[PDB]
Amino acid sequence: MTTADLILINNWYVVAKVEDCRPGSITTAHLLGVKLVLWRSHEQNSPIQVWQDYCPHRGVPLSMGEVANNTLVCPYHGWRYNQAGKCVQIPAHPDMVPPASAQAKTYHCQERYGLVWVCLGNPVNDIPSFPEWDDPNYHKTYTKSYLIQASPFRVMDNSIDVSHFPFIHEGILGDRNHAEVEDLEVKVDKDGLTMGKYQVHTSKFNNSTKDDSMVNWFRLSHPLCQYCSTEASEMRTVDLMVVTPIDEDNSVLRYLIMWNGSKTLESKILADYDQVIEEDIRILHSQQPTRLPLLSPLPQEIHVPSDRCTVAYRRWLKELGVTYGVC
Amino acid sequence: TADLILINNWYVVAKVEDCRPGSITTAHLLGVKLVLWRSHEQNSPIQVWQDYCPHRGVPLSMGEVANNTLVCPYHGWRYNQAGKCVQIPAHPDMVPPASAQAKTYHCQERYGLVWVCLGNPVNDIPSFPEWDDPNYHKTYTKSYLIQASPFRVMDNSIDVSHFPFIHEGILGDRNHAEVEDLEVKVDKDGLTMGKYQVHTSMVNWFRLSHPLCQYCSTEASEMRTVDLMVVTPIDEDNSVLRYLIMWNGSKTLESKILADYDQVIEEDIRILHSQQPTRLPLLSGLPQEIHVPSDRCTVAYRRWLKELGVTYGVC
Amino acid sequence: TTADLILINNWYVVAKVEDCRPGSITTAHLLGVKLVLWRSHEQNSPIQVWQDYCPHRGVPLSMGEVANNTLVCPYHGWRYNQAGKCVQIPAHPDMVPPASAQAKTYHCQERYGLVWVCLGNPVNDIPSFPEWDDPNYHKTYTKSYLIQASPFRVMDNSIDVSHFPFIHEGILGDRNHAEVEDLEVKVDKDGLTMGKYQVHTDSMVNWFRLSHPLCQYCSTEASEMRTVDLMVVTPIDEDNSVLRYLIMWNGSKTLESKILADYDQVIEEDIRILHSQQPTRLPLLSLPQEIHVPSDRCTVAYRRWLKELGVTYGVC
Ligand code: FES
Ligand code: FES
Ligand code: FES
Ligand SMILES: [Cl-]
Ligand SMILES: [Cl-]
Ligand SMILES: [Cl-]
Ligand SMILES: [Fe+3]
Ligand SMILES: [Fe+3]
Ligand SMILES: [Fe+3]
Ligand SMILES: [Xe]
Ligand SMILES: [Xe]
Ligand SMILES: [Xe]
């Protein structure tokens, strides 16, 4: 169990990539305070089973075992658990039907966009949409996993912030001179939080090429995933940022990036995101308190006109009833 | 703090070989930091006290042994073998106050091991019959620091069904994983398991007179092997493992025996370090423990600890 | 924060002025508060000591840059003037920052080459040091010593004199001269005072006074040379301290490194003991309870003064 809210437990979250889960493999992960085991059978096109990493016999992690004959086997006594989590065999008592109590705690898992989505509760919410996934004109790439020692909601608040661009992202996403921020259009509606189109000022790098005027916008249907859309000179680049809430104070950041330009741009896209993500991590790791402060009437946070979309985020979290990872 | 039932039992804290004349050693029992010291005389007794000087809270272990006294390093106070301050160097003519006294504990050398009771010895040190048999040879395993409850360490050692999966080299085969109807008896002696078969041929039985001490007996084709497993309870979540192995076959087998014991212990320590909760769950976030017929000796250990009133190291 | 106001309303050294050169950003910690110390390229700019905290989104201001007499936060470039008022917000260039856009500032006074800070309202003055003005005395500063021990245990160890023959053998005593004479201890409204006493090696006469719980003035007269010192403890929190010493002497300048070496040896010998002592915090008067003998008169008096002042922070 956990101290997490039901609004959060009943949502889907990315815990891995499908390319990390090979046939016959055992992977560990952490979601909302719970340790997880992700396993597949040696069959090809095998389903991924996401359970709690715990054998109920003597408390040994099931992730220390082996996958054999479509069963996850515990290392201590060799209890064999089927795809539904039911012990189907106890080697010490091979003719005995295992007790019904011998059951692993199983969760909902679904693959989409090459990502493993998990729901610890009742899947009542839907997986965010990524329209360009099935567009053959768009190429796909994934960033590596980033472990961040900061609240899941502080990480998302940062990626909603845009006024920091000319300071901690100078040279990639901002100009320390064009640092004034225009009035921002931010909607709160049925589709979630939308930052409307807005101009990103980037520093010239190629003096031969024309200014890469970038227009960006983003939408949040889920509070820990953000769909971002950028149209520059000759390329539209969309991304799906996904935050794995490890606990109230820890988070994993992953991005699926899709672009309509030359596949040869993959290396540059991945390296440019690395720079921005690590410049953002430096601030996230220093922020206090570690949990995102919600609104109220250490001193309270101060909000200026340019914080419109981040004030609306903190408001959305109070409406959703979020108390985990926030203060 | 620990339950009186544990406070009044004997526990191994060191090997006699390592407490030399004039030496000062350290140990940790039931939450208490301990100082062990000997005088430079031969046949000197071992004094096991709390590692603390009552003047200003400095560890007496950072001091020195001099003239059959332990000297505190801060103000020079000298404590006799009974633990009483006999000289305060700033007041050389003053009879040191009665409060100037170290907290002393009972110490007894048995089986080449230093045994300590922090309470009132109500029970005797566990018996080891082959200690007095000259037909048996003697070897000691090294110390093993385990980040697990002392009671989880003993539960693992009482378990016999794990042999075919984590010990398939020495104590089990994957084609012989079935466990026969085991025999368990909890009497005044303690917890006793009746003899059972172990597949590498071998017959094995064990008895626990005390919760953290195990006597084990194994008969092979040509050799009887016995061991005394001692668990030092550092605190609720930490333990030290030691064994005294005795056998009546060739003394040349000492190295293979120690090598075999090391493999098994480090294979058990891997499961022990992973177990959650860290403290032993007793019979009463994470689901409750499930018990199968092959778990009757470990179910009896948990029942015994509950009956004895153990609340320290257990969940 | 959980500290007693008697402590919050007192002056403490958090740095030496030689460590905060023009245009620098230094960090410190005092009574649980993280502090940012910053200066200007003004050849003689003052030292600002604020809480290491940007009230916009909670970044540490110490990760910023000093520019044109302002401290600039790294996250959104907010510029705070020397009074701590934010005067620029780059996002809204022609917007006067709200009154809330203000760093939490603390009182800072430079004295004896040291940075004194008071987190509250200074009801007391910075401890006195008469040989500072005396031109016949040379001056030197020890390095900062981080001690994993209560500020009050650190000060307890400095007032102890009975331990000189055992852990400071060679500098403040030897094992053949361990008997302690009847010490003169004056506990008054001003504070704790310790009268003249003999330190062996062939001997020197020392005394000390404490007008402040965590500041000690000491005087040693030996063979015509008088050495004085000001021991300052930075209370980091209940369990941690910084130790610093300003030593002044009227002999040869050549003695400086020897003086520094003698202090360094004694201090690290004291730190070996301080780190081993349990409990970490200083036990006051009503693990076994502390026993007191006559050589411990001035250390018993320290505990009695702290209880009368109502110190609960850093004490057991
Ligand atoms: S702990 Fe998993 S089978 Fe015994
Ligand atoms: S601390 Fe042991 S003698 Fe003073
Ligand atoms: S956090 Fe300091 S300026 Fe935004
Ligand atoms: Cl399989
Ligand atoms: Cl025992
Ligand atoms: Cl003073
Ligand atoms: Fe950013
Ligand atoms: Fe084992
Ligand atoms: Fe000293
Ligand atoms: Xe980016
Ligand atoms: Xe063994
Ligand atoms: Xe000194």
For residue B65, give the DSSP letter.
E
| Burial of residue B127 (number of CB atoms within 10 Å: 0-12, 13-18, 19+) | middle
Chain centroid offset of residue A144 CA: 12
Nearest by CB to C93, from A180, A286, A288: name it. A180
- Residues in the 5 Å CB sphere of ion ligand 4: A 41-42, 70
Distance from CA of A76 to the nearest CA of B (A): 6
Resolution reached, in Å? 2.7
Q: Report the C-alpha gap between A54 and C49 in whole angstroms.
A: 51
Task: Name the residue among C55, C88, C51 with its Cα closest to residue C72.
Answer: C88
Q: Residue A15: enclosing H or E segment and its boundaries?
A: strand A13-17
For atom 4 of ligand 3, the residue with the nearest CA is: C76
Q: What is the sign of the dihedral through the CA atoms of B84, B86, B92 and B94?
A: positive
Phi and psi at C315, nearest 5°, equal -125, 155
State whether residue B305 is helix, strand or coil. Answer: helix
To the nearest 5 percent, what fractions of chain A are helix, strand and coil? 20, 30, 50
Q: Where are the domains of chain C?
A: 5-118, 138-309
For atom 1 of ligand 12, the residue with the nearest CA is: C263
CB atoms within 10 A of CB A317: 22
CATH of segment(s) B129-308:
3.90.380.10
**Residue from C161, C179, C276, C300 whose CB has the most chain B CBs within 10 Å, to mutate:** C276
CATH T-level topology, domain B4-117: Rieske Iron-sulfur Protein (2.102.10)
**Shortest CA distance from C168: residue in chain B:** B74
* Bridging pattern class, strands C25-30 and C33-38: antiparallel
Task: Name the residue among A202, A272, A200, A266 with its Cα closest to residue A229.
Answer: A200
For atom 1 of ligand 11, the residue with the nearest CA is: B261
- The answer to whether B8 faces chain A, any CB pair under 8 Å, is no
What secondary structure does DSSP assign to B120-164, as a single string? Answer: ---S-----GGGG-TTSEEEEPPPEEESS-HHHHHHHHH--SSHH
**∠ CA B267-B144-B151 to the nearest 5 degrees?**
80
Q: Report the C-alpha gap between A186 and A59 in whole angstroms.
A: 49
Q: Report the C-alpha gap between C151 and B302 in whole angstroms.
A: 47
| Burial of residue C170 (number of CB atoms within 10 Å: 0-12, 13-18, 19+) | exposed
- Does the Cβ of B260 fall within 6 Å of ligand 11? yes
**∠ CA A79-A80-A81 to the nearest 5 degrees?**
115
Which residues does chain A have within 8 Å of residue B179's beta carbon, measured at their own beta carbons?
92-93
Asked if residue A91 lies in contact with residue B178, where contact means CB atoms within 8 angstroms, the answer is: yes
- Does the Cβ of B261 fall within 6 Å of ligand 11? yes
Query: In sequence order, which ranges of B159-253 are alpha helices (DSSP H)?
Result: 163-166
First-to-last C-alpha distance (Å) of chain B = 15
Buried b (16+ CB within 10 A) or exposed e, C64-101: bebeeebbbbbbbbbbbebebebebbbbeeeeebeeeb
Buried b (16+ CB within 10 A) or exposed e, C216-234: bbbbbeeeeebbbbbbbbb
- Does the Cβ of A272 fall within 6 Å of ligand 10? yes
Task: Name the residue among A169, A160, A176, A178 with its Cα closest to residue A303.
Answer: A160
- Widest distance between CA atoms in chain B: 78
C86: its two tokens = 């934010």
Chain centroid offset of residue B9 CA: 11
Query: Under an 8 A CB cutoff, do A77 and B161 touch?
Result: yes
The chains in contact with chain C, meaning 3 or more Cβ pairs closer than 8 Å, are: A, B
For residue B281, give the DSSP letter.
P
Q: Report the C-alpha gap between B300 and C260 in whole angstroms.
A: 66
Phi and psi at A95, nearest 5°, equal -95, 0
A1: its two tokens = 């169990």
Buried b (16+ CB within 10 A) or exposed e, A108-118: ebeebbebbbb
Buried b (16+ CB within 10 A) or exposed e, C126-156: bbebebeeeeebbebbbeebebebbbbbbbb
Q: Report the C-alpha gap between B222 and B216 in whole angstroms.
A: 17
CA atoms within 13 A on the CB side of A234: 5
Asked if residue B243 lies in contact with residue B227, where contact means CB atoms within 8 angstroms, the answer is: yes
C239: its two tokens = 């369990």
Dihedral angle over CA of A271, A274, A275, A281, nearest 10: 180
Task: Name the residue among C96, C179, C18 with its Cα closest to residue B91.
Answer: C179
* Bridging pattern class, strands A87-89 and A80-81: antiparallel
- Does the Cβ of B56 fall within 6 Å of ligand 2? yes
Q: Report the C-alpha gap between B193 and B300 in whole angstroms.
A: 10
| Burial of residue A267 (number of CB atoms within 10 Å: 0-12, 13-18, 19+) | exposed
- The answer to whether C177 faces chain B, any CB pair under 8 Å, is no
What is the architecture of the domain spanning A139-320? Answer: Alpha-Beta Complex (3.90)
Q: Cβ neighbours of residue B76 under 8 Å, at least 6 residues apart?
A: B87, B88, B89, B90, C165, C166, C175, C178
How many angstroms is it from C193 CA to the middle of ligand 2?
23
First-to-last C-alpha distance (Å) of chain C = 18
Q: Report the C-alpha gap between B175 and B98 in whole angstroms.
A: 68
- Does the Cβ of C204 fall within 6 Å of ligand 12? no
Residue labelled with tokens 């021991």: C231
The alpha carbons of chain C give a radius of gyration, in whole angstroms, of 22
Q: Report the C-alpha gap between C181 and B90 in whole angstroms.
A: 8
- The answer to whether C29 faces chain A, any CB pair under 8 Å, is no
The alpha carbons of chain A give a radius of gyration, in whole angstroms, of 22
A160: its two tokens = 């909603």
Buried b (16+ CB within 10 A) or exposed e, B267-281: bbbebbebbeebbbb
Distance from CA of C8 to the nearest CA of A (A): 17
CB atoms within 10 A of CB C270: 21
What secondary structure does DSSP assign to chain C, as a single string? Answer: --S-HHHHTS-EEEEEGGGS-TT-EEEEEETTEEEEEE--SSTTPPPEEEES--TTT---GGGSEEETTEEE-TTT--EE-TTSBEEE-TTSTT-PPPTT-B--B-EEEEETTEEEEESS---S-----GGGT-TTSEEEEPPPEEESS-HHHHHHHHH--TTHHHHSBTTTB-TT--------EEE-SS-EEEEEEEEE--EEEEEEEEEETTEEEEEEEETTEEEEEEEEEEEEETTEEEEEEEEEESS-GGGHHHHHHHHHHHHHHHHHHHHH-SSSSBP----PPPP--GGGHHHHHHHHHHHHHT--TTB-
Q: How far is CA A36 from CA A14, A26, A47, C10, in A?
A: 12, 10, 16, 52
Q: What is the sign of the dihedral through the CA atoms of C315, C193, C17 and C253?
A: negative
Of the options 1.10.238.10, 2.60.40.10, 2.102.10.10, 3.40.50.620, the CATH number for the domain spanning A6-119: 2.102.10.10
State whether residue A109 is helix, strand or coil. Answer: strand
Q: State yes or no: cis peptide before A289, omega within 30 of 0.
A: yes
Q: Report the C-alpha gap between A77 and A61 in whole angstroms.
A: 12
Q: Report the C-alpha gap between A265 and B81 in whole angstroms.
A: 79
Q: Residues of C annotated in the binding site, as ranges?
A: 54, 56-57, 73, 76, 78, 163, 168, 270
| Burial of residue C181 (number of CB atoms within 10 Å: 0-12, 13-18, 19+) | exposed
Q: Report the C-alpha gap between C278 and B57 in whole angstroms.
A: 5
- Does the Cβ of C197 fall within 6 Å of ligand 3? no
Q: Report the C-alpha gap between A157 and A120 in whole angstroms.
A: 24
- Residues in the 5 Å CB sphere of ion ligand 9: C 270
- The answer to whether A77 faces chain B, any CB pair under 8 Å, is yes
Number of the ligand closest to the Cα of C270: 9
| Cβ-based contacts under 8 A for chains A and B | 69
Q: Is C8 left (phi over 0), alpha (psi -120 to 50) or beta?
A: alpha
What is the architecture of the domain spanning C138-309? Answer: Alpha-Beta Complex (3.90)
State whether residue A116 is helix, strand or coil. Answer: strand
Pocket test for ligand 1, best of A54, A64, A77, A89 (most atoms within 8 A of CB): A77
Strand runs (DSSP E) across chain B, as ranges?
11-15, 24-29, 32-38, 46-50, 64-66, 69-71, 78-79, 85-87, 104-110, 113-117, 137-140, 144-146, 184-186, 191-198, 202-210, 213-219, 224-233, 239-247
CATH T-level topology, domain C5-118: Rieske Iron-sulfur Protein (2.102.10)
CB atoms within 10 A of CB A82: 16
B266: its two tokens = 């480090």
Q: Cβ neighbours of residue C234 under 8 Å, at least 6 residues apart?
A: C12, C13, C14, C28, C29, C30, C151, C241, C242, C243, C244
Q: Report the C-alpha gap between C280 and C23 in whole angstroms.
A: 38
Q: Residue A320: enclosing H or E segment and its boundaries?
A: helix A308-320
Task: Flag whether A30 is marked binding.
Answer: no
CB atoms within 10 A of CB A226: 23
Asked if residue B264 lies in contact with residue A34, where contact means CB atoms within 8 angstroms, the answer is: no
The alpha carbons of chain B give a radius of gyration, in whole angstroms, of 22
For residue A253, give the DSSP letter.
E
- The answer to whether A302 faces chain C, any CB pair under 8 Å, is yes
Asked if residue B212 lies in contact with residue B10, where contact means CB atoms within 8 angstroms, the answer is: no
How many angstroms is it from B230 CA to the middle of ligand 8?
15
Asked if residue B257 lies in contact with residue B263, where contact means CB atoms within 8 angstroms, the answer is: no
